[PDB]
Amino acid sequence: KPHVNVGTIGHVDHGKTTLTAAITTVLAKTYGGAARAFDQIDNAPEEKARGITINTSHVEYDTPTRHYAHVDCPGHADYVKNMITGAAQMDGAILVVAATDGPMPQTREHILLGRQVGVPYIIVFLNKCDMVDDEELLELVEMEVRELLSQYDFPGDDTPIVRGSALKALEGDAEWEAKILELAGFLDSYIPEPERAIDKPFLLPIEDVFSISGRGTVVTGRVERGIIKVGEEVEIVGIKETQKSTCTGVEMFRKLLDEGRAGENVGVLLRGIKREEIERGQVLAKPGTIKPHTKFESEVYILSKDEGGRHTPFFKGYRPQFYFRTTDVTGTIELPEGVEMVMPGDNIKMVVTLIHPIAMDDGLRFAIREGGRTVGAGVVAKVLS
Amino acid sequence: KPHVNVGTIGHVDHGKTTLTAAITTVLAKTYGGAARAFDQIDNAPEEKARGITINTSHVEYDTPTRHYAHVDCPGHADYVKNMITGAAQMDGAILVVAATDGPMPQTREHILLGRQVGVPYIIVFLNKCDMVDDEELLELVEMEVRELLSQYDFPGDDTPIVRGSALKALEGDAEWEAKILELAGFLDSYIPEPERAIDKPFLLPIEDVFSISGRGTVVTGRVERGIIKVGEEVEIVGIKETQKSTCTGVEMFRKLLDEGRAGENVGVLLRGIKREEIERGQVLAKPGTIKPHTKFESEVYILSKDEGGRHTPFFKGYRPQFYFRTTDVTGTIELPEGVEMVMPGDNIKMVVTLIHPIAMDDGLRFAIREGGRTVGAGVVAKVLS
Numbered sequence: 001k002p003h004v005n006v007g008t009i010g011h012v013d014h015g016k017t018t019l020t021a022a023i024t025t026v027l028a029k030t031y032g033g034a035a036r037a038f039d040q041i042d043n044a045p046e047e048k049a050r051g052i053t054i055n056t057s058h059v060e061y062d063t064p065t066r067h068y069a070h071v072d073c074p075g076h077a078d079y080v081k082n083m084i085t086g087a088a089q090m091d092g093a094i095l096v097v098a099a100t101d102g103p104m105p106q107t108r109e110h111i112l113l114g115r116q117v118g119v120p121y122i123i124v125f126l127n128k129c130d131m132v133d134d135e136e137l138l139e140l141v142e143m144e145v146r147e148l149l150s151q152y153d154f155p156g157d158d159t160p161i162v163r164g165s166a167l168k169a170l171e172g173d174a175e176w177e178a179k180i181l182e183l184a185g186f187l188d189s190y191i192p193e194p195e196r197a198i199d200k201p202f203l204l205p206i207e208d209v210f211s212i213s214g215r216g217t218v219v220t221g222r223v224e225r226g227i228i229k230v231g232e233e234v235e236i237v238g239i240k241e242t243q244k245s246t247c248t249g250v251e252m253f254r255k256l257l258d259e260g261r262a263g264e265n266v267g268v269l270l271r272g273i274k275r276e277e278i279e280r281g282q283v284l285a286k287p288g289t290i291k292p293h294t295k296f297e298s299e300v301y302i303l304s305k306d307e308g309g310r311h312t313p314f315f316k317g318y319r320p321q322f323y324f325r326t327t328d329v330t331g332t333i334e335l336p337e338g339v340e341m342v343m344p345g346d347n348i349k350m351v352v353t354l355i356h357p358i359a360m361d362d363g364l365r366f367a368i369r370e371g372g373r374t375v376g377a378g379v380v381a382k383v384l385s
Numbered sequence: 386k387p388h389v390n391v392g393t394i395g396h397v398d399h400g401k402t403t404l405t406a407a408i409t410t411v412l413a414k415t416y417g418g419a420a421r422a423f424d425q426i427d428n429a430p431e432e433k434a435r436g437i438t439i440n441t442s443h444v445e446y447d448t449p450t451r452h453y454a455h456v457d458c459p460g461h462a463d464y465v466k467n468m469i470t471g472a473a474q475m476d477g478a479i480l481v482v483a484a485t486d487g488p489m490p491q492t493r494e495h496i497l498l499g500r501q502v503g504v505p506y507i508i509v510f511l512n513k514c515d516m517v518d519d520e521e522l523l524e525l526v527e528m529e530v531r532e533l534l535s536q537y538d539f540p541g542d543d544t545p546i547v548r549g550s551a552l553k554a555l556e557g558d559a560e561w562e563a564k565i566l567e568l569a570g571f572l573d574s575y576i577p578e579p580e581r582a583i584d585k586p587f588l589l590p591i592e593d594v595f596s597i598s599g600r601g602t603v604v605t606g607r608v609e610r611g612i613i614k615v616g617e618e619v620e621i622v623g624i625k626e627t628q629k630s631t632c633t634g635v636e637m638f639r640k641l642l643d644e645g646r647a648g649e650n651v652g653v654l655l656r657g658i659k660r661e662e663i664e665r666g667q668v669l670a671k672p673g674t675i676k677p678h679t680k681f682e683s684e685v686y687i688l689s690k691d692e693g694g695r696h697t698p699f700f701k702g703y704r705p706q707f708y709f710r711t712t713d714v715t716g717t718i719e720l721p722e723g724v725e726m727v728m729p730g731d732n733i734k735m736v737v738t739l740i741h742p743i744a745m746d747d748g749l750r751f752a753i754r755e756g757g758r759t760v761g762a763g764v765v766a767k768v769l770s
């Protein structure tokens with residue numbers, strides 16, 4: 001069964017955990033599986049992703065045709081970090097909005113971040129409908145939500161909004177539980193089949209390079225995505241002028257392979273290239289699938305003095321190291337209009353211009369370092385140049 | 386969305402129609418759609434399925450992932466005609482068994498006809514559970530159902546049995562509607578999407594043969610299934626010794642193609658065989674996919690006077706013309722013990738022995754004719770010799 005990654009996003013107290021509990025419980029009694037209690041999910045453990053600590057609960061549940069890996073976090077902070085660092089990626093998100101209070105600041109920001117980090121589909125769940133009988137009222141809250149989604153480029157008009165009560169569903173009210181089954185139905189239908197990494201174009205971040213007489217140059221690394229097969233044309237992108245060559249062998253500790261697949265640590269033989277022509281930070285790519293760039297717009301989270309970050313703010317003029325895959329690249333920071341200084345612990349949008357071109361695309365994550373110390377983490381919101 | 390064909394089957398008054406209606410109601414209520422009234426489904430209209438007349442109600446409904454075309458018949462005789470003639474196609478079936486009575490004569494009859502006809506999957510809806518309040522009874526009936534299915538080679542052990550109430554579901558009881566959502570779940574999961582005709586092994590019933598000057602022998606016909614391509618090898622099966630040759634062209638009214646596929650009326654050029662080597666009744670097939678036979682066990686439905694069939698019954702010693710694809714082949718009938726007469730409008734099982742071997746396999750449909758007029762319709766249940 002396909003595997004989809006989703007999670008609940010939304011303002012605090014709007015019911016993200018009761019809903020997550022309700023979902024696992026109702027799908028378990030209906031389609032089979034195991035229910036998770038609210039307390040267990042509420043008590044989220046901490047995980048250290050990219051030096052940052054984040055509280056994240058992971059649950060799993062099944063619908064007759066799919067398997068879901070679901071994340072739920074205690075606070076807004078955990079969502080900002082988790083989304084920017086790419087700790088728990090989502091093929092789709094379930095926006096939980098309380099019908100009693102309507103959209104709030106964190107609701108708008110999670111939608112904001114959702115777009116920036118690249119969450120492709122959002123399904124809305126109008127929670128707490130057991131407290132609101134007023135049909136016209138419920139409709140207003142629905143209009144607000146639809147337009148908020150549209151502001152941030154999500155198709156609010158086609159967005160599936162499901163009305164329900166996560167508390168009553170969990171409670172065991174057969175009428176409300178059906179609303180969960182309705183939501184699960186939308187998960188299965190609205191969110192399309194996600195692409196497996198192996199289906200994505202070949203991409204290998206160059207880790208190290210060696211040379212063998214007659215056989216040529218071997219560049220090693222872990223295949224990020226796709227598959228490289230012996231005898232096919234491959235490009236060396238980033239750092240310098242985009243080169244091109246041909247794979248002539250794939251090795252794995254002496255063992256010769258016909259191809260190298262995603263997740264595998266291999267060594268690829270390149271015919272027509274010398275070690276000297278291979279700089280640090282370059283990636284082997286399927287011809288014409290990735291391009292080097294220098295300018296890009298991003299979303300960044302600056303660690304707090306406590307997380308091991310700076311104790312002092314930085315200003316427009318900060319020139320840090322941007323660590324991409326295998327190397328640091330210095331660049332210049334362009335802050336948002338009206339921005340003054342960026343305090344440790346802040347998350348903002350900044351336009352970066354790298355000194356040397358790096359093969360990148362939307363969603364590429366990076367760390368902002370000062371010497372050896374990680375000072376931030378970011379994601380390429382969109383390539384500018 | 387994938388399109389699957391199913392239908393309800395089981396003994397009278399067990400709940401096939403009430404279930405068919407609850408499905409359209411609950412699915413419409415949950416995943417969107419239109420409820421169909423019980424009465425309209427119950428009072429099935431007549432359809433003239435190839436001379437034959439059957440009462441069949443056709444309803445449609447959707448789950449989040451698929452669209453279903455569902456048949457429900459008013460009487461046992463309609464299920465028999467439907468299955469034998471294949472007027473109604475069933476990718477899967479929902480066997481409805483009342484918990485108050487357990488398996489009855491038509492339950493077993495429908496399961497057997499399901500076998501004989503080639504109904505691949507059977508889901509069980511243990512209906513009327515609002516009546517039976519003792520668990521012990523429920524388990525006993527379930528076992529009996531499973532045993533019975535196993536008897537006819539069905540995976541009694543692995544068939545999903547849903548316990549519910551079609552009546553309570555129809556009335557709008559949330560608790561019992563859940564069980565229909567459960568049932569919809571199994572349809573989505575337990576029933577595989579059917580094979581496309583172009584995915585099955587090539588088969589082309591030869592309608593005529595000519596010999597093109599300087600090119601060779603051409604056999605005309607409509608590709609029943611699969612694809613034929615130039616350079617591919619084919620076997621001419623039926624009547625005599627099986628021959629093998631090579632397709633060196635697939636013409637189509639002067640236009641020369643490189644392939645012929647399921648559904649097209651083409652001209653297959655063969656290398657080697659002379660016109661005089663082809664016989665009526667022979668099929669062109671992918672090597673080793675179909676063998677010629679002479680003896681088989683079948684299920685037949687003798688048309689009635691009003692259906693344009695026989696106006697007089699026949700007795701043992703009847704030598705009818707069996708029409709297989711393109712020709713009539715005489716055969717000798719062997720009725721069951723005690724059956725010493727066959728009335729029109731009657732269905733009967735009969736072992737047949739043909740005067741000449743015809744390429745066939747289980748589930749093959751044929752017609753019984755008398756001077757070009759169809760007086761019967763049957764299906765090869767079990768190939769014997």
Ligand SMILES: Nc1nc2c(ncn2[C@@H]2O[C@H](COP(=O)(O)OP(=O)(O)O)[C@@H](O)[C@H]2O)c(=O)[nH]1
Binds near residue numbers: 168
């Ligand atoms: N009445 C009602 N209370 C709800 C509902 N969903 C959640 N709550 C309550 O609202 C509070 C916050 O819920 P919680 O799941 O912790 O929201 P989160 O902050 O988004 O994770 C708790 O008191 C929940 O039981 C609902 O549908 N109806």
Ligand SMILES: Nc1nc2c(ncn2[C@@H]2O[C@H](COP(=O)(O)OP(=O)(O)O)[C@@H](O)[C@H]2O)c(=O)[nH]1
Binds near residue numbers: 398400403
């Ligand atoms: N108690 C009860 N009666 C039911 C249920 N389902 C069907 N029936 C009744 O059994 C009778 C036959 O139902 P029907 O659907 O017409 O049966 P069919 O011959 O299988 O088509 C009708 O009176 C239904 O109302 C059920 O869940 N519970």
Ligand SMILES: [Mg+2]
Binds near residue numbers: 042072074
């Ligand atoms: Mg929570």
Ligand SMILES: [Mg+2]
Binds near residue numbers: 401402427460
């Ligand atoms: Mg009926």
